[PDB]
């Protein structure tokens, strides 16, 4: 019943890029959350493999922002005269977004 | 006045902006950092910046202020273009003037 | 070099350009697999394929070959309802019921309808009927030994019964195609065949898969009525004609092909002539359809080997261009 | 696109293109100014109903066709041709007019 | 990640209307968009996994050989004398 | 007379200007008398009346 | 394909926009092949001619004068329909929608006027913009011609009345004609004008030949050959109609002109020349009613 | 953005309102065509199947004629732009009188 | 487009070649479906039956037989006309030059007619090589069927 | 056009298509195994028998 | 991409659909609060010292 519980699912689509190891370093592919009552009667009569997590990814993700932006400048500030300075001004922001 | 205020010689092209749909793929070649994927995203970014850099500088370099004849005319503190284009572009096309 | 720049095709393209101007093995295959798609893609409407699943009761793709006429057989289920009406009352309209049943008896609805009558199977069914024999019966020997004389006889009884009651073989049996590739299983067949376009350009090869050749061989020296007895060079045309006997011979069925340069508005005239079978006097015989152009007069060939020794006429190049049925009289 | 029709190949250039409104309100007004010419003759010419689509006639056959050929014969309108179910009333013909 | 497998990227398409917030009763037509994207890197997407067959154990039961001319054949005969 | 046509119009001061271009008549300029517009004919008089 | 993009009008109700979404695969007749067309130009309110909404005859006229285009993609603020008449033959497979009988793997669907079947059924009204769309029914040519003649046949009996035409099993299916009720009164009132042009063109054809044959062959090879194959057919029909009827070369010839025209105008209206064919592949081979069917431009 | 006039009373102090607005760019085509004659190509090709002929004076006179065609159809697009313009301006313009 | 070339025979004239330049868009009846053809097979001299020129009901019977082809382009030594009875398969729509007092409308089926109007004219003569060209008058089928009825009844 | 977007934007759709159809290759690798079964299961008599 | 298996027969060939699987994110609040007595306001800032 466990191996069915343990294996009824589809592996996800992801590669975390930091995986939970088991301190020998085999990766952790599962979770299996329980109630302490069941966990107890389960651990004594059934499952007892290795206790510590060799690795857990102590950080939290990241994102790369593809850029969509609308330059809205303020002219009459010397930008005014050449409003093609608006063009080179937006294209500046893309470098700062990079 | 009758010569056209410096009138375009050019079109005004478009800089790609905001088209992201961030997409990449690798197999893991010279790859020991899944980041090598992420760092390959930043690769794909710097190409369009140099493209718009090229696209912008091209126009800012592109020739400005060709002077055309046309009749700029004053109606009540407005300079207007009086344009009847028949003998010009609808000349003898069999296409009726609209 | 000069003969291939035109053959491998650049010059027309250049004119176009100027206008604008002013696991290792698997990897190799993937690279190549891709090339084929791109080239096919870079390259690029002269072809149309229709595909259908039927039984092998009537028809039969394997017996037939690379170039063959397949005719559709619409409304098998329908026909009895049609027989009661459009038939003068003294026609014993119960004849078909049994005859279609009889044809079927010789051999339900299920999931594969029996559509797709082959050209062959008509030549044999009417072989003894139309007035020629053993050049015609040689085709009948072909079908009994490859495709059953029962079904031929049952189907002949149906043709007699149909021509009897004013439900004709046409207004049934429209043209389907040229038989590219059958793909049969057991009693089943999936027949690909050309809706329209040229024949010679399809699976091609010596034969499209390993048997032999390709052709639109009339299959009869008995069929291939070649008009233009008196003719001038021109694109030849291909029609499909059913000739009938209305008590002159007891509901005769004649099925053959005419090849001459006349645009259908001129074929009705030449069909009026060449027939002494007009002395039906209810009214009607000789329907015709244009199979398609043969935009070269010359490929009609004289040969007799196929499957048994059959008179086989080979037609070199054809552009099936099917059209509709016209017989008003 | 290049197609071979007459005498050889034929090229057809085609340029997809599109457009918008830069105005919030109306950025263009149309006026009528003058009248170039009156297209129509402008007067002195009647309606004649013996042309259009008949009616229930005078129930005496000699009455109806007396009035008909009485009115129709004087007018510039009434058709020489009999009225056909398919087609047109066929107004009478001449050479030149004013 | 076994060699190959085409490791891909998980992109998050997220409609960001700023300046909606901040100040201004920004009002738009609808059928309008100021869409913004960002790509998610804590993890990556596995686009495809390839099965090799031979890598299977069913590959034993046959002698697989690649005869490219098989398209051109007519009949293959294997004859046995016993 | 009809009012299907008059009914088929709009009364939108919002719209009243843009169907103005549309014309409430069906003839063509190449006929002898103004006729009923043949089917082939398409139209954009400004049709005030 | 040469797509032509019909412009949806200004704001339409959300239930109307969902009415159009369901109209993909339906046949439209577009008056001109201009790339940009309005929706009002396509809508049935644009078929008005004599100040009235057209009858089944007035429709069949228009269906022969404008261009049918199947709807390919319906987009908010557009409709993209690809005219059936334009391009090479046997190309531009565009999907149809089957209505009624099956549409087997061929047979050249004709688009016949809607009223021949449930009348208002298929009106598809759009209230927001106040227009409507009547989509023709895609029936095969043999069956489309059988039906349209079947109903004018029933129409005349009705003209003066004191064997059911209305069963019409097509292939496996027995297609019911009559929707009973007053639909027939609505069907028969729209075929009213088609029935007459049919009754007239017959009665005017016979009496014109029955007067001409005896008023010809009495003034060569004309005589002999005529009476030859006409034995007990034309002449017998002459005595029999002249029995229950009345009997002028000058009115004869001028009436023979006006009939000969009106006749062929009905042969044009009638015969419902096929717009398209069905040529399937990797497909069912029979398109069940209400299912999109492949289709190609020439028979 | 939409303008604000300041005010001087406790009465509601209006807060900036800003209109994002979208319009629909349409499709147009504007196609032109020119043709060449199977006898005209063989001047351009310059090579016989036989591989002999047409020395290099063949081009100079041929491309002239072909420039005549390309220049003629590039003015069909510049005159087409003036139509596409003038049409979408009056498609979208209301009379003065109204 | 299976275009049929038609070789101007030779002869010809500075004035005759200028006459053929304006015959593009007109219709020709060719007595075959060919690739190689002679200019004289199209001419009205070919319409001549034994010893006699057909009348204007005889032409309709001659245009019944043979194939209408609309001239697309005319080159110095050939005339290109694609035989509508067959080679009508073009993506877009070959140009027909309306030669008639009439006017087509949109959607009007076009059937041809021998020239038949009093102000009609339409015969063309080419003196360098003895031959002429009568071009049929295109016309809406409603009108072309009214005419044929007139000619039939008058005969 | 000789630009950054077209030359470089169309290539990234080539790997897209190299991805795509490399996927339908598994169809033959997976289909190869699949075939082995049918021809092995066709040979096989029931063990009971 | 999703797996395919090439299959024998003309049945129409595996039609490979290759898409970008999308999803809809969710949003929760997760709110919490804490005590701050009017005392320890005068404090802290320095009002009452």
From TrEMBL, chain C:
One Gene Ontology cellular component annotation held by this UniProt entry: viral capsid
GO biological process: viral capsid assembly
Keywords: Capsid protein, Host nucleus, Virion
Transmembrane segments annotated in the record for this chain: none
Disulfide-bonded cysteines: 126-253
Molecular function GO terms recorded: DNA binding
Name of protein: Capsid triplex subunit 1
Organism: Human herpesvirus 2 (HHV-2)
Organismal lineage: Viruses, Duplodnaviria, Heunggongvirae, Peploviricota, Herviviricetes
Gene encoding the protein: UL38
UniProtKB/TrEMBL annotation, chain H:
Name recorded for this polypeptide: Major capsid protein
Superkingdom assignment: Viruses
Gene for this chain: UL19
Species for this entry: Human herpesvirus 2 (HHV-2)
Organism placement in taxonomy: Viruses, Duplodnaviria, Heunggongvirae, Peploviricota, Herviviricetes
TrEMBL record, chain I:
Protein name: Capsid triplex subunit 2
Disulphide bond pairs: 1-82
Positions spanned in the full protein: 5 to 159 of 318
Gene name for this UniProt entry: UL18
UniProt superkingdom: Viruses
Residues of the signal peptide: none
UniProtKB/TrEMBL annotation, chain K:
Tree of life domain: Viruses
Name listed for the protein in its UniProt record: Major capsid protein
